[PDB]
Design a protein around this ligand. Structure first.
Ligand code: 0AN
Ligand code: CA
Ligand code: CA
Ligand code: CA
Ligand code: CA
Lengths: 94, 107
């Protein structure tokens, strides 16, 4: 598990969750997370980066998909799906 | 664990079964009484499929004890909720949760 990918998602999700649940700011939540997702797209490199991707990468990609869906739907059920995935990862990297 | 304390009884006959979609209205509060979320504030009944562990353990076990129409208070220890981790932005570590739950229907 790449320490830097772990750290950036740990801190990122802490911030995104504060903005969403605490400050009622869904745009702010999406803005913090978008560059973390883009960082995953650039694809692994270390052995540890690859290990991170195998454990969490598909779950993270799907969480972004649910967010994107929320952007068209406005249905909180979609945003819940996203958080289910984000929290699944968060809990394992903490 | 979870304690279920009835406020208003259900029909005593129709209980959630594995694989059913359970439809509820709820309000969640921390042990101190601060509301953190409520389906009633958005006028949107909350749904989950029993047995999928899509919701915290206290819900899975507590709501399964309810019958249709029932309204109850669920008191959920951290280990049956978000545990040592909490959920960032909303549920602190080691939080006891208290929910008011109304089982509206099964689909
Ligand atoms: O198990 C629950 C419990 C019990 C059923 C109803 C909601 C569920 C509702 C979440 C929700 C509602 C509206 C908007 C956003 C979310 Cl996440 C959440 N879950 C499953 C779950 C999904 C995703 C992440 C964490 N936990 N709770 S909750 O009230 O403890 C809750 C509410 C919110 Cl607004 C966020 C969290 Cl993390 C938990
Ligand atoms: Ca998978
Ligand atoms: Ca999956
Ligand atoms: Ca949902
Ligand atoms: Ca859960």
């Amino acid at each position: 598990m790449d320490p830097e990918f772990m750290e950036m998602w740990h801190e990122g999700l802490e911030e995104a969750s504060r903005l969403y649940f605490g400050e009622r700011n869904v745009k702010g939540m999406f803005e913090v997370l978008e560059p973390l997702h883009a960082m995953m797209e650039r694809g692994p490199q270390t052995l540890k980066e690859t290990s991170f991707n195998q454990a969490y990468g598909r779950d993270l990609m799907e969480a972004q998909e649910w967010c994107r869906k929320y952007m068209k739907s406005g249905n909180v059920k979609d945003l819940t799906q996203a958080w289910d995935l984000y929290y699944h990862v968060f809990r394992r990297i903490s | 664990g979870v304690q279920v304390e009835t406020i208003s009884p259900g029909d005593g006959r129709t209980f959630p079964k594995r694989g059913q979609t359970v439809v509820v209205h709820y309000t969640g509060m921390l042990e101190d009484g601060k509301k953190f979320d409520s389906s009633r504030d958005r006028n949107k009944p909350f749904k989950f499929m029993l047995g999928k562990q899509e919701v915290i353990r206290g819900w899975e076990e507590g709501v399964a004890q309810m019958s249709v129409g029932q309204r109850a208070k669920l008191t959920i220890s951290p280990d049956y909720a978000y545990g040592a981790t909490g959920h960032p932005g909303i549920i602190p570590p080691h939080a006891t949760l208290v929910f008011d739950v109304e089982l509206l229907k099964l689909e």
